[PDB]
Structure formats: structure tokens, C-alpha cells
A paper describes a structure:
Crystal structures of THAS (here referred to as THAS1), a second representative THAS (Cr_021691, THAS2) and the structure of the promiscuous homologue (Cr_032583b, HYS) were solved and mutants revealed key residues that control the stereochemistry of the product profiles. The HYSs perform a single, chemically straightforward reduction reaction that immediately neutralizes the reactivity of strictosidine aglycone/cathenamine. The biological unit is an elongated homodimer, with each subunit divided into a substrate and cofactor-binding domain; the latter also being responsible for forming the dimer interface.
We recently reported the first cloning of a biosynthetic gene encoding an enzyme that acts on strictosidine aglycone. This zinc-dependent medium chain dehydrogenase/reductase (MDR), named tetrahydroalstonine synthase (THAS), produces the heteroyohimbine tetrahydroalstonine. THAS1 and THAS2, which produce predominantly tetrahydroalstonine, were both crystallized, since their amino acid sequence identity is relatively low (55%) and the predicted active sites have numerous differences. Structures were obtained for THAS1 and THAS2 with NADP+ bound (THAS1, 1.05 Å resolution; THAS2, 2.10 Å resolution) and in apo form (THAS1, 2.25 Å resolution; THAS2, 2.05 Å resolution), while HYS could only be crystallized in the apo form (2.25 Å resolution). Interestingly, a non-proline cis-peptide is present in the THAS1-NADP+ and HYS apo structures. Closer inspection of this region in THAS1 shows that when this bond is in the trans conformation, the side chain of Asp340 is projected into the cofactor-binding site such that it would prevent NADPH binding. SAD/CAD utilize an active site serine that protonates the alkoxide that results from reduction of the aldehyde substrate; this serine is replaced with a tyrosine residue in THAS1 (Tyr56) and HYS (Tyr53). Mutation of other conserved ionizable residues in the THAS1 active site (Tyr56, Ser102 and Thr166) did not result in substantial changes in the distribution of products. Mutations to Glu59, which anchors the NADPH cofactor, resulted in a slight increase in product promiscuity, perhaps by causing a shift in the cofactor position.
Residue numbers in the entry:
A (entry chain B), B (entry chain A): 14 to 355
The structure:
Amino acid sequence: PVKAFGLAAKDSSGLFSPFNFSRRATGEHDVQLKVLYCGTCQYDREMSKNKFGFTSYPYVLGHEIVGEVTEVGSKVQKFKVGDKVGVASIIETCGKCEMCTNEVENYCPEAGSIDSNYGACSNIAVINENFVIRWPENLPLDSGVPLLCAGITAYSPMKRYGLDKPGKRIGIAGLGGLGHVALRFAKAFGAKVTVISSSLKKKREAFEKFGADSFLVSSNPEEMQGAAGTLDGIIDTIPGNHSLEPLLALLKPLGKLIILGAPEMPFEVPAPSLLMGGKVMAASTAGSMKEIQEMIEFAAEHNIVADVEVISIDYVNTAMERLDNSDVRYRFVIDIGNTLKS
Amino acid sequence: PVKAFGLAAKDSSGLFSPFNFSRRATGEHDVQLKVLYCGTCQYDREMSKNKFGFTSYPYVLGHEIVGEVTEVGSKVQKFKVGDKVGVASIIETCGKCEMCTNEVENYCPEAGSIDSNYGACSNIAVINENFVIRWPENLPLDSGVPLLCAGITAYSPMKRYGLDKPGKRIGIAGLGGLGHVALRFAKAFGAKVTVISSSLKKKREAFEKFGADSFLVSSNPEEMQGAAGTLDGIIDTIPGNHSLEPLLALLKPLGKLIILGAPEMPFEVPAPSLLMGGKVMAASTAGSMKEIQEMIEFAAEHNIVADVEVISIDYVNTAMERLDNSDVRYRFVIDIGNTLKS
Ligand SMILES: [Zn+2]
Ligand SMILES: [Zn+2]
Ligand SMILES: [Zn+2]
Ligand SMILES: [Zn+2]
């Protein structure tokens, strides 16, 4: 019913092009919004090329969204026309399951992603009110929008596994985009932060602007050994193949390794690397609506943003190529509001 | 100073023989005890043959101990002559570290095991009072003694990771020496218990003798898929090589797999097997003195014992051989008090 336009790919090459379609009318509990900025990452490139078998074409990307409310339904009280809002990857769930009723609905077995019925790299989106967040006034929209993907991904497990308290010794493994964001949250929580990287080229970048308290080169066995058994937890953001044994060795007994990337090679985990000290390894995906709300207010309070490269709608194909397996520091953010046209 | 006798091995063959030695005099904070029953397990056989490189000869086994107090030091108030007591694997720690001061001293980097300075398959032992537990009156000494190794091993992580509440759906993988004990704790906590086993030979036992609420054959892919995403946690007691993927698939989102065995082959863990649902895997060794005390009183309250085969001192070599095959139903317990002589 409501006319819309955006970018879509016709096949698994992942090449996007201008695409007309339509969205539903603003129902009783829905929020229509004009999209202002569309944050972009690996997920988009992988979905565009059907990496996981479940993409259907034509495919419109867009899972990290900030925008301005254009309509609200008759029952919607939380939001009004003109409000700045955010939308994350998950926009519907079943509502009945244990994960849904305990407000950890990001883990609903039947969770529906925003890009399944056309993503929001598009002029307008329409989203059920319970999956929209009120954007804080003190947070920029362009450099803030990636907090809805990278930010929540780090934030959720940091809260869940108690890696969020002053004086915790927290490792960050990998310092791409995702790692930079996780690092900024760890600092804001008042943690003593160690960056673990495979190269000295990253040391200055780690230390900059009241960042890391320590830096470990993972290929230096003297440094890694010196830090054995010292960390309360590690946020592992490394996207490609790596061993978990050297990270597990940095943990204190009972410490926690949180895995956020999805490397192709399975991890090899000798039982002793967990048994010695009763260590924990856990993974995590995205976060709940309650967590995203708490997360974005915390970002605002502590002035946390992502490093971004802002782009026009024309540059999306080239960006896709460039972000592929790169976990780039300056996350590509599309200025939908100013550059997308009919 | 105080004359003692026991069984010791001379070399890494693991062959034990009668052995005279001596212990220290009962110091100000020590408890001397006559050993009544010495619980035995895989650790003893592996230590006897130097499997891990740090056994020194001559070697006296004995890490699961119940006994009668024969002397107490001038400062000891908690215990008196004639009291029934228990002693576990760990009998000293550094006292200064974070793990020591937070009463999780089983994870002390400098923890000293009872068998390092002659184990307690011997007529007498002398132990610092802070590493002795008061044996509850309603628990049998012979069938209770393995609770100090197997019982605490299951109990500690079940408390730590919240797998200890009524209505929790808890899997028990492996139904042997350690599993049968873990099963009994899960039942006592009021859990709905699923036994996961590689063979139908164990079904009737699981139901009739352990009151499992469900049984899964791990080599039946229809059964395993039917139980996908149903368990709050799994206690994995399987001692030899196995994959964790089928166990992780049984867990609810955010569920926990607790690993207690030490298989020789590393676990192969694809990132998706943890990422899909934000699952946790953790290992654990033994438990603290606070945990063992709480554990043994809970055992007594809920009438939890191990299934034991009692043996005389002369049978220890044969018992040890039989442990290579786990050829026991389900633990060997040495009657030290009645069968060990000068
Ligand atoms: Zn993203
Ligand atoms: Zn649901
Ligand atoms: Zn034992
Ligand atoms: Zn210590």
C-alpha cells in the first residue's frame, strides 16, 4: 500500500541497484519512519551473496537504522511524529517462548530479521513499536548508528557475564571496528583494558584517546606468558581463524572468554585449557530490546560512538567489496536521508 | 616422628606394595585421624603410572578419605577425638591469592594435593583443620566417601552455574562413576533429568535405578533432534573422546554445558554451535572447602551416596588394573580400617 524505494540485489553476485517496492500501512502498533542513516557491516555482504543459503531475491539490505518518525498507529504512546529512533536487526519474535517472556527475545527460535521482508536501506521503514528504540539527543545519528549492531553485540555479553564493573581486567582480542567499540564500552565501565593483537602496528591506536591500559602482542611469547592468569574476561572479536588456547591462558581461574566472530575453521579446545582453572567460553549474538535501550543511553552518557566513514547511496556496491572480511575501523554508514532519491 | 604404614609404588609400573614411612607430629592446628575408608578413582591409577609427568616415587595413593579423629592440636576447637571426618584432594593452599581469600581455594595456583606428600591409603593421616570436614552422622562412611571427589566435582559447578533449582531441565551425559553421582544431585535439586547415553543398554538403569525423567540415545539422530533446544544445562561426565556439538544442540539458548572429563583429543567446536543461541561451555575441577561442607550436608539431607564396591588392601593392585576399563560399579572403596595391618 505505502510506496517505497531502495537498493536491492537480483542474484547472489551481491550487486545492488535502484529498486521500487512497497511496505505495509502503519498499523495500530506500528511506527513508520524516514531512514536517515543505515549502518552497514559483514552481515550485509554475506546476506547479499547468500552465504548461508537462506537469502531470497530480490534482497534489500539494511539492519542498522536511525531515522525520524513519520507516522504512529492509534495505540502507540511511546513515540510521536518527529522523534529520532533506532532499529536493530531483530524486528519480530514469537512472543510466547521462554526467551520472549524473559525479555531475551533476541534468542527467540522464530526471531525475524529486518532484512527478511526487505531491509531498511530504503526511504521508509515500518516497525512494530516494541522493536523501536528512542534515540538519545546527545548521540550523533551517523557515528552512533553502528552501536545498534557492534555496540549491542559487545554490550549484551559484557552485562550478562559480569564484565562490566570498575577494576575488572578485561582483554579485547582484535581491534577492527567491532573491537574498537567493545574497547570503548570496557573503558566506560571503568575496566582496566588490555588489547590483544597479532601486530605492534596496532599499539598506538590501542592507547589513543584514554584507550587501553595495556597492550599484548599475541605472537610475543614472553609478553603473553607475563600476562598468564591475569584477566577477568576477554571479548574475542577476531573474525577469522584463530586458536582460543592463548586467550584462555590469559584468564584468571573462573574467567570468561566471550566469542563474537564466526570463523570458518572450528576451534580446537583441549579439555585442559578449560579444566585448569575452571574457565568459561561463551558466544553471544546481538541483544534484547531492553539491553539495546540500556546500551544506547549508556553510550550517550559516556559519549561512545563508532568511527565511521559516511557514504552516499551510489557508493554502496564499492563499500560492500571493501568491508568484505575487513572488520574495518571506519564502519561504512549510508546517508539515506540526504542521498537516496526516487 | 609419628610412625605410619601404607601402600606405595616404586616406579611408573603403578604396582603398589606394603610401605613404611612416617608423618609429622600433630601441630597446633592439625588433626590426626585413623583412616577408615579410602575412596579410589582414575586419578589414582593415572598418578601411579606418572601419566602427567609430576609424580615422584615412592608414591602413596589416597585422595578420598573418611576417618576417625585420634589427636587434635592445642588450638583446634572445631573437632574432637572420636569425630568422624572427611578429607578431599586439596589439603593446603597459599592463603594469600584472590582464589584463597574468596574461598574458592581449590583454584589456588599453588594448591597442594594430599598425595604429593604421601596419600592417605595409610593407617593414619594428619591434616590442617581448615581442610577437614565434619562427617554428617546420617551418611554412611563407605558409600559416602566418594562424594568427596565425584560429588563435589558435580556439586560445585551445578551451584556456580545455576543448574541447581527445581524444574531445571538438566542433561547428564555419561552414566558411570561420576555421572551416577551427578544424576543423584540433579534429582535432589528437583531437576527434570535427561540421561544422554551412547547405548540403549543403559535406559532401564537410567529410569528404574536413577529415576531419570527422559533418556536419549546419542547415536539415534531422530531422538537427539527431537530434544533440540530443550535443556537448561548438561553435566558432561564422558571421560573419553567425544564431540560437544550434539550436546550443545540439546541446550536452550543461553544454556550451559559443564565439562568434567579430560579426554585426550581436543574438542572441535564450530563457532555456530555456540553462536546460535549464545551458549556457554565451562569446565570445573573439584570444589572449595565451603562448597564441600555445604555439599556433604546436602548429601546427608537428601540420602545421596555413591554406588561402591568395597575392597581389601590386598585387592588394590587388581582394582587399579580394572579402572583402565572402568570395570567397576561404580567406585572402588578400600576398607583401610579393617584390612590394612603392620
Ligand atoms: Zn551490522
Ligand atoms: Zn519467541
Ligand atoms: Zn577420586
Ligand atoms: Zn592461593
